């Protein structure tokens, strides 16, 4: 059974306007800004961006990826899918 998300978990991202893109569940750093109750800090591959999204917008990597882990004319997504799959832990 899943549980609930937890800091370091792969997920497609869902934000409006855009497609399901490659992203992890951040930390929350020492000193850094918490996010509102029931939302998630998501860290967004290719572009580095962060937004605060709840689980209603996030889908599990390893279940999605087949169906939203392919190529896309966006800028910086398929940067990000590179992330995903080689370094998805790292700091960028």
């Known amino acids: 059974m899943p549980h609930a998300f937890k800091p370091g978990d792969l997920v ?3 934000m409006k306007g855009y497609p399901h893109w490659p992203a992890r569940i951040d930390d929350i750093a020492d000193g850094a800004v918490k996010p ?3 939302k998630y ?3 967004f591959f290719g572009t ?3 937004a605060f999204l709840g689980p209603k917008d996030l889908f599990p990597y390893d279940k ?3 169906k939203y882990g392919k ?3 966006r800028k910086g997504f398929n940067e990000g ?3 995903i799959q080689n ?3 790292a700091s960028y």
């Open 48 to 50: 580095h961006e962060t």
């Open 71 to 73: 190529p896309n004319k």
């Open 81 to 83: 899918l590179w992330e």
């Open 12 to 14: 497609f991202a869902k």
């Open 64 to 66: 999605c990826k087949d």
């Open 87 to 89: 370094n998805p832990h």
């Open 36 to 38: 509102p109750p029931n």
């Open 41 to 43: 800090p998501i860290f």
